[PDB]
Amino acid sequence: ESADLRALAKHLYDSYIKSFPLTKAKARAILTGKTTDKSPFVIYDMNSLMMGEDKIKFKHITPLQEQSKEVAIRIFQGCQFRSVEAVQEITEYAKSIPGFVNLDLNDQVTLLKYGVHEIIYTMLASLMNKDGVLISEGQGFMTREFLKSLRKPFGDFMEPKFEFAVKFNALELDDSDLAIFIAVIILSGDRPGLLNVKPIEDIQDNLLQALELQLKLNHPESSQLFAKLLQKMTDLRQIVTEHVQLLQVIKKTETDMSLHPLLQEIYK
Amino acid sequence: ESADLRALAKHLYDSYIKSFPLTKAKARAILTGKTTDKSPFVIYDMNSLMMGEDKIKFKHITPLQEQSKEVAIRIFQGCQFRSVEAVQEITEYAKSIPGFVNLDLNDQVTLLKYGVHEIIYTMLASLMNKDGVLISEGQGFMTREFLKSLRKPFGDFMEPKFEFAVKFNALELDDSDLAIFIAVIILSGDRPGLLNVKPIEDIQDNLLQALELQLKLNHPESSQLFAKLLQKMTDLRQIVTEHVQLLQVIKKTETDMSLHPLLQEIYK
Numbered sequence: 334e335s336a337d338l339r340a341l342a343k344h345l346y347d348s349y350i351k352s353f354p355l356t357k358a359k360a361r362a363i364l365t366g367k368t369t370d371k372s373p374f375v376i377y378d379m380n381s382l383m384m385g386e387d388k389i390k391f392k393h394i395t396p397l398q399e400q401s402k403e404v405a406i407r408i409f410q411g412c413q414f415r416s417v418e419a420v421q422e423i424t425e426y427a428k429s430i431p432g433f434v435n436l437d438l439n440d441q442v443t444l445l446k447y448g449v450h451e452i453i454y455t456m457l458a459s460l461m462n463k464d465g466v467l468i469s470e471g472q473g474f475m476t477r478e479f480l481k482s483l484r485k486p487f488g489d490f491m492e493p494k495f496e497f498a499v500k501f502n503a504l505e506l507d508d509s510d511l512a513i514f515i516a517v518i519i520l521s522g523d524r525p526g527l528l529n530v531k532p533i534e535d536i537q538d539n540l541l542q543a544l545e546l547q548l549k550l551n552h553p554e555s556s557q558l559f560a561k562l563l564q565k566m567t568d569l570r571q572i573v574t575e576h577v578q579l580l581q582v583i584k585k586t587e588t589d590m591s592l593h594p595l596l597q598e599i600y601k
Numbered sequence: 602e603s604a605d606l607r608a609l610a611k612h613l614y615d616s617y618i619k620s621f622p623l624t625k626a627k628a629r630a631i632l633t634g635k636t637t638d639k640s641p642f643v644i645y646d647m648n649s650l651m652m653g654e655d656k657i658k659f660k661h662i663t664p665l666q667e668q669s670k671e672v673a674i675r676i677f678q679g680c681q682f683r684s685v686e687a688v689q690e691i692t693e694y695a696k697s698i699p700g701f702v703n704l705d706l707n708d709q710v711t712l713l714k715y716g717v718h719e720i721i722y723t724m725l726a727s728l729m730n731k732d733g734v735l736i737s738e739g740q741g742f743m744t745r746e747f748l749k750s751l752r753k754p755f756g757d758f759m760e761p762k763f764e765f766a767v768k769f770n771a772l773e774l775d776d777s778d779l780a781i782f783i784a785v786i787i788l789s790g791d792r793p794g795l796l797n798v799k800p801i802e803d804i805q806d807n808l809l810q811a812l813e814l815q816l817k818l819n820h821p822e823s824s825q826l827f828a829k830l831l832q833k834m835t836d837l838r839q840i841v842t843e844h845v846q847l848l849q850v851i852k853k854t855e856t857d858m859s860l861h862p863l864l865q866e867i868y869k
């Protein structure tokens with residue numbers, strides 16, 4: 334019944350708001366510099382980076398970089414910390430997906446393990462525009478250009494994310510839509526090492542119906558949006574890989590830099 | 602309109618039947634399926650290959666294993682031959698899809714160029730079962746066991762297609778279904794280098810509606826099958842990506858020789 338699919342759609346949207354302090358709506362309100370009720374400080378060079386520590390809460394360093402964790406590492410660590418924030422956040426959203434917590438404890442861990450970064454980049458697109466990405470809860474805005482100019486390695490960590498987000502955002506999706514799509518991603522079952530696949534696919538079968546109806550209702554004039562969105566799941570998978578291998582490179586060229594256990598545990 | 606979507610399906614099916622010798626319906630009668638009226642020649646071991654490869658309808662080389670060319674290599678190059686045949690079959694099919702030829706020729710070459718590998722592994726799965734793959738227009742059956750028993754490079758060449766195949770076949774799709782899915786794969790839109798993505802996506806949109814109608818009417822009880830088929834695309838891409846990987850590795854085994862020139866040329 335439709336009435337049941339809409340109720341689940343309302344449910345998930347609801348938990349989505351409660352689990353993510355920064356929705357796409359808040360994000361676009363800040364990005365479209367019309368809503369000047371609170372604008373972001375912009376980082377596009379080293380000076381701004383320093384000055385950034387001023388206006389925004391940057392526990393990081395302000396002055397010298399190189400001989401004291403150069404700019405590149407500093408941002409990378411900063412980015413590392415947020416990812417941990419997001420996982421914890423995403424993990425809280427997951428518990429609310431009907432049926433998820435009733436699965437084998439092991440699978441729960443496996444679903445999170447593979448689905449988390451795929452989710453981080455999906456939601457990360459909400460904080461991006463062709464020119465940049467929001468940081469520190471919207472208060473800041475770091476330039477894509479400044480990012481694409483960091484030290485040899487770190488210099489190409491976000492580019493594949495921007496490329497994904499610009500075309501993904503062109504789908505004009507909203508929080509209520511993403512809420513369901515985010516859940517569909519978690520309850521895969523095609524995930525490596527699962528014990529009970531049928532119970533997982535039964536949940537996702539629901540999420541997909543929910544999403545199909547939600548997209549029809551929310552975007553009547555958008556033919557086949559449902560399918561276009563599912564295919565986007567390939568671009569996601571590909572991004573994770575580019576990243577994971579990229580991560581492997583730093584680890585070797587930076588034996589002094591560390592990887593937060595929670596993020597380290599996910600990668601494998 | 603459903604009428605128009607029922608026409609496009611039958612059209613593609615008709616083209617499909619005439620472009621591909623071995624149909625899934627046929628191949629299935631031969632495989633695990635009984636339908637015994639001419640049992641294929643089973644290659645399960647080295648001698649089986651040797652002792653058949655001399656009676657089987659294979660055109661390229663013969664059983665000569667004794668410091669006279671390696672077996673693994675002869676088998677690998679054999680797939681290349683068949684894949685190159687397959688590529689011509691697909692092209693012949695691509696041309697029957699409404700709108701395809703009306704596209705920028707450069708874009709057609711780009712679409713076939715990148716859609717071909719995914720189409721091959723998809724269709725390969727029709728000739729596969731959990732224990733082996735039909736060979737030579739269906740006159741043979743090379744076991745999965747023998748394939749993983751191969752040397753060192755070549756021992757993991759086909760294993761991932763088997764893992765993909767077994768899950769893919771779990772969907773129980775038939776030639777009428779595969780005919781539309783295949784078309785959808787060719788009419789992507791995200792292939793690198795395209796020049797005019799719009800028409801390509803318009804046709805895919807039209808092809809997607811067809812696959813959706815087809816699956817609903819053809820598999821009424823199989824819920825959300827459409828969504829599940831579309832996510833098999835991630836699996837394909839990974840297969841494809843991971844394949845070019847061994848390809849580069851193999852490129853570090855056999856190479857510099859003067860009797861290969863005009864042969865190496867047929868397969869870039």
Ligand SMILES: CC(C)c1ccccc1-c1ccc(O[C@H](Cc2ccccc2)C(=O)O)cc1
Binds near residue numbers: 408491
């Ligand atoms: C917005 C964030 C998720 C992000 C994504 C992709 C690339 C970089 C970042 C990023 C986020 C915050 C950054 O600066 C600090 C990071 C930080 C936050 C809290 C404690 C320690 C560091 C901040 O904005 O608060 C720098 C980069």
